[model samples]
Target: DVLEMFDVNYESPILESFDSTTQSLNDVHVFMSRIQMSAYDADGEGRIEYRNLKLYEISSGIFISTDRLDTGASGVEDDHEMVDYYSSARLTREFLGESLDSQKSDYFEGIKKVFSFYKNKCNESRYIKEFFEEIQFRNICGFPKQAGTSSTDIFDQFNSVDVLLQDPVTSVWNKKVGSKKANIVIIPPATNLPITEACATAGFQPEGFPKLGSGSFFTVQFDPFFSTRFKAHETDDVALLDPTLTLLHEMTHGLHFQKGIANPVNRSGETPAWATTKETPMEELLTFNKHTIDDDIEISDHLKSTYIGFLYNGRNEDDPTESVDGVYQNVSSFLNQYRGFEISSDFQHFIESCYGVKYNQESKKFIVNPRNIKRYVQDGFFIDEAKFARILNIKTRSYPDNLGVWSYRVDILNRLRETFDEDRGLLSQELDFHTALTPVV
Candidate 1:
């Protein structure tokens, strides 16, 4: 038998202070709330809604099907040894009726674009398509139907949001439908998850999402709030929930975790001090594909030179510990701007080069003139890049950057470029694409 390490309470940081394994990792944490798209947004702009978000730790049928050697409980084991780790491993605190549910609907709309991006832009790989076709997003969060049939006891203890979801039918339904959600993207669709799996030997429901662990506050962590509402055209206003870039970036992380997530003592081959993990078939393909595709997309795709993600690693805040909206902005900014950013940009500033951030000395506001920041490219050319799309989308496509690899990073990026939406776009003034680098993947 394998001993699983778990975060009984998914609240602990897995980075350092995490220790506690589920008999088997069958659950992941989850929480949901809202936030302003980002501080940059003159007002929360763009159409990238919350769309459905998730983080996966629950086991996959496909994954489990491949490892059939154990052959039941008759296997040998070492008592002192340990081991671990998804679908129903969850703890949900999502929105329900009472004004909040309305916002959930908005996020529901935002997440749809993500699906469309991969479906239309990254349609090259049959795998990507298959994944989408098989996966479904459900948001059955809200008031307890029977208890709150009337609005008498809305957000109170008797009809509490937390207890309501645990109702057998409600729990099973939401767990199968909306219960467990996330912020970390692990696999193609399972990115941005919140997890702390349950017992490997935990009982499972036959028809829907696996019955998740309870008493565990697993739920959607960071939520959207205070987004400066604005028109759909402002591309510069990027926030954690802004849709395209954030969603795409985190989704890539989810994919990385799924493709291959591990922390190694000796980390190498990273240029941006990006703090990514060790060697994995997934990241290798991502690196090689990015190296080869950048110039190709620039030279051949006929798209405008753009600048973006300059602040990805440099989005500094007044206090690195202050909380914005509901969650900590500095932390979110770090994940969005630094650690998670691996895309090519038109900006040529060195890692630490201050592009253009100065105190106005007027309105007392800081002025930021990021060097040719490439936000994201939606219309005009990136989407018209049908040829590159096909090449990148190829599941069997090979990248010489690393010996035979898996996970088509080319297609992963190609789709982001092709499906032009305001949620994400290339942002920058102007720069030479030829010399631009894909320093990290």
Candidate 2:
């Protein structure tokens, strides 16, 4: 029962169809299919029909054929409302997706049935989030797309997505030390999202997503990727097995761009501005409200770079992107964060609670480290305007390579100078960290 599913580990924000007394949320259908199995000749059709069947509920889906079953061979009539010579078994139930809110469990169990059941919920809000997250993810998404998969869907249990392609971001490496920054194209994977390609192949300019957006990253051709990851799966195991990591891993890119005190240099590929300053989208810069923790909110950075060698790679390393340095990069930086930053078990549990993930230390099948749990604590940056101004003050002008990042903040600081006067002048958004008072390793 949808209500039973909703009953466990659920929350909502006033669903449109929430009823006052019976407490039934709306379950709108998107697509419907029917299956029928008739017993040999008998009284009338004696048909047993299920109404509004959903895609996942079909049990056998298209795999189980009625003709394949030897019902006649059994010859013995059993209870499914079937008589020896005449009765029909039809499975039909509503499988259409809904925009479930407050009531549905998308992140609760990290299950496909939950995630895909109501993906379209908060879609526009999330579209905007993904657009920016993509902007940041692709912007600093320093890794490669695994290469073979067509698309990465957190919930393949989801109905197929709509693909809309956008134009390739202007490639960096335009100059030696190749005056460029890492470039990426941001498109959502659910709903045939990279339809960005559809847009691109359709011969249109990359348009702004009034829906959502992303970073200095590359987007692969969909046909080249998703054909295998999702479509070919056995009907019973079609949903993504581990979707939380996909969510965290991808968001890490966006966090990387904004998590640091100074934006790590993918700011539009080494232009005089990019090469000179570790810049990022102005809007992506925001502060956290430490509040009771500090009586103030702060704009902090990741404070460490898992990709320390990356910016210099194009200028120095034999392999520019450090695609080979995955371990060297994220792990070493991860160690640095862990080496000094330890969280209390209380803190760790609090973190898990937010994502709606139930964390039990014993279950072997239920491990959570892949969720990037520790990374969040390790990356911190400047919220105080003076400290930020200090980093932008060109203290590193002595080093010729950092010429741009070192000098660029001064320019930003100048415009936000009045903001500096007010203390948090440049910080535009506020994150709440005071909710949990804890620590970790």
Candidate 3:
């Protein structure tokens, strides 16, 4: 029976254990369960037997029987023996040593080595490949027509005037618009207990706070289980996938600040430099009217004025504490309640304009689009730099004094706002297109 089941082609790994040998045990169990029942009433007695039946000697005719029907000692022993044999067989197959103790040690060592290999090489490769692929997808989806170009061409375009021009805070703001660019990194998901537990064990917070996805890093991680589910249920395109989207979203957060733009008020506590510029008319009003207005009139005047007066007034417009920290809150409220739909629409349009050229809904894959890809890069990297400056209260080298930096920041903020409005307007159009094409739930 062992000879029949053995396969010469099978090669065992150096170490084995429950994890390694589970498949073998599963196969054996299936084989045993399907075995047909046999009878042994050789002496005309109502009984079953299997003892003293030499497995290899067919002519021996030696049999042991019991009158317990199918519940005899022979049958019980046969069943029990089979179970024991399989158990021992599985143990031997999984462990490298002949004995249980030696085999266990080998199994543990093998596990350690396997995990080490995965951590040192496999995981790094996975992350790097995913990052590069995401960049490609973003480029294609943002600018589909540019897919045929080489990586160098793409990189050159990314550094071109159009991309650089979008970064209002940078000196290149006046440059001609050419192509967009974004930087992204995909990390392990927050929900992964192993990663979360490791962070917690090391006394690190896992939540993204200062960063879009949490922590001090501008990174996005995928929920492993959720990613698996998406892979199973959605199109198999590895590029324009959920993991890539998550990375893209987080990267967008970083880009939002870098381009001298602002993050949506809901996600950050920092006041956008644009707020200062946009609320300038009100700031002027507050400065001029502060001394002339009475206490009751001040509250009314401030409430009727722009965001600056409403928060900085002696008597707070929204809170009795006269707290001026409501600048970020007010912006968040506006974005969520008034402008959220519009912003989402703009993002959607951006996706379609660039991604539509090669999009295949059935396969969920797209031929890379150059223009759309550039837009994403612009949104995630260039604009994000500006937002970072605002949130962190960054001051330029030229601005030795507070007033100069503030003034400069305000100007940069206005430009960022214009860029956002322009790009987001396009994104909004794409959202409509997606809705029209997608099936209704």
Candidate 4:
């Protein structure tokens, strides 16, 4: 009675459509072809389509006629949809020149070797590790490493980058360091188009981003030198600069400028910090807040260099008003005030000895470069003017008794006479005073 209630031959649009699509005869045939056969049919009763589809491999199980199997853009309406369809994992493997034969040598292996080095270095170097962490913390390139994210998780963000092989014949060697040629370009994930060539320099194509459906992903390119030097040097930490580190550096540039729209949500189920919460333009993000970390490192180093250089050559070398030790001590104490903790002994030595006093080669005498004084003076010691004056007086031992006499302060003013000639009279009013200074101790 139940069997009679529903006819086995009952046909609906779904079943009829499937039967018509695969051109299978009946229920048994439908089960065999539709259920058992591959969607990408080979040697079956179906017509193949799609222009870009190519035969990737012909191996064990099902391999033969493209006429029945390869269905290309059969019903896809949108261009981007068609592109997405064409860009399957299979197609990607073909596009990247993945080796079909496991028994033989492959070009892809070399590329893998280069990338492995990048990961290992980031794994080893704290600076490199911290850079990645900070980027994830700030969500700089759209991927945020939330809690429970492992080091491998952070490192994997860069591990599977897309690569396009550059033909050495036509490609140019942009970086040739003393006959060692190497270069790798880290391009931003801005478009879906296959990258044909490496960008010669770092920059962005504003229009290339936020296309949403169709655009590029993070694509990398290796130039002649990249392989040349990588092959020439075999050690992990070679005296000669490693091309892998260069790759790390260039990849950092990629992360710095990477647009945020394409990245996924974090563990909090929110958009990445770099991406828009309110649909902001990608170009606007590119313009502002570029390279905060790099700029911080650079400017801090620059200030340290300027401070040390000024101490070494800020005043007349012949001036005996202040002992070098006393001046260094005062400056050291003054510098510590700005830091959260006192500077380490080793690092302090590095700063002081990094650059020595300037001297004239021909005369073999100390050269007074007044510019060093003027540089730090203009920066206001990156601190208070009153405090700087107090430290100066103490360093020079300007006692209350010699209230009007010239000291090391005047020695600097004397050397700076030419540069600050216009301001000399004005400067003398403040710098010439003999205020009773407190010792740094």
Structural similarity to truth (TM-score) of each candidate: 0.24, 0.18, 0.18, 0.22
lDDT of 1: 0.22
Candidate 1 regions exceeding 4 Å error are: 1-99, 122-242, 259-262, 266-441
**Candidate 4 per-residue lDDT over residues 19-88, each given as its tens digit:** 2355432222101111011123334334322121111111111111111123322232212121111122
Best candidate, lDDT-wise?
4
The C-alpha lDDT values of all candidates are 0.22, 0.22, 0.24, 0.25
TM-score of model number 1: 0.24
Clashes of each: 82, 70, 55, 8
Q: What would the per-residue lDDT of candidate 1 be over residues 1-441, giving only the tens digit for each residue? A: 011112322232221111235222223233221111111122423221222222212222111100001111211121111110011111122312214343333333333333444445334555434333222111111112233233221222111122012235443312221222221222211111212111111111112212111000111122111111111223332111122322332333232222111111111212212222133332233322333334575542221221112112222335443211211122222223333223223221211121223333334332333231121111101221222324333111222123111111111122233422422322221122111111112
* TM-score, model 3 to reference: 0.18
Backbone-clash count (model 4): 8
Reference-based lDDT, residue 256, model 4: 29
Ten-residue segment with the worst summed lDDT in candidate 4? 29-38
Model 2, range 1-441, lDDT digits (tens) per residue? 111222222222212222336642123111122222222333333332211111221111110011112222222222111111111111111111223231122212223231222232214334323433332222121112122322221111111111111223653211111011212221212111211111111101122210010112222111111111111122321211112212222333333332221233322222222223155332222221112122234322221232222322222334454222222233224223323344455434533432223334443121235334233323322132222224322111000222111101111123323312122222211112001111110
**In model 4, which regions exceed 4 Å deviation?**
1-105, 132-218, 223-241, 259-441
Candidates ranked by TM-score: 1, 4, 2, 3
Q: Using TM-score, give the best candidate's number.
A: 1
